[PDB]
Ligand binder design. Structure first.
Ligand SMILES: *[C@@H]1O[C@H](CO)[C@@H](O[C@@H]2O[C@H](CO)[C@@H](O)[C@H](O)[C@H]2NC(C)=O)[C@H](O)[C@H]1NC(C)=O
Ligand SMILES: *[C@@H]1O[C@H](CO)[C@@H](O)[C@H](O)[C@H]1NC(C)=O
Lengths: 50, 50
């Protein structure tokens, strides 16, 4: 996927490996090397108006 | 089978009128929507995200 990875405070269970929101879209993931939870924020976007 | 209310005829006549003697100021609430969320969608990004 694509996004911005940031530190998080969500306590994932040891067997848990992904986080999803109501939309089932990826919310946060755990680094396979460091057992730490990182939140995924979709990159800033929108529309340019004049 | 629903009642539709308590039946209450009226002692109608050709010469008998009922006048109110006392009055009540009452307060009621009426609620109306005025607008909705101003949603916006990028068709291009949505269909073919990256
Ligand atoms: C009109 O009606 C109101 C209430 O329905 C009367 O006010 C009440 O009067 C009684 C006296 O019998 C008091 O004990 C109550 O405390 C009053 N309540 C309120 C909310 O005011 C009023 O007296 C009536 N007036 C007439 C001329 O009939
Ligand atoms: C493997 O991952 C652990 C957990 O972070 C780390 O401490 C260790 O250094 C890693 N292995 C190597 C060879 O660095």
């Amino acid at each position: 996927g694509t996004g911005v990875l940031t530190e998080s405070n969500k306590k994932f269970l040891p067997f848990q490996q992904f986080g999803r929101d109501i939309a089932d879209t990826t919310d946060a993931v755990r680094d396979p090397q460091t057992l730490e939870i990182l939140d995924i924020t979709p990159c800033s976007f929108g529309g340019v108006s004049v | 089978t629903m009642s539709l209310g308590v039946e209450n005829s009226v002692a109608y006549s050709n010469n008998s009128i009922a006048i109110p003697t006392n009055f009540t100021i009452s307060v009621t609430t009426e609620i109306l929507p005025v607008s909705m969320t101003k949603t916006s969608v990028d068709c291009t990004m949505y269909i073919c995200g990256d």
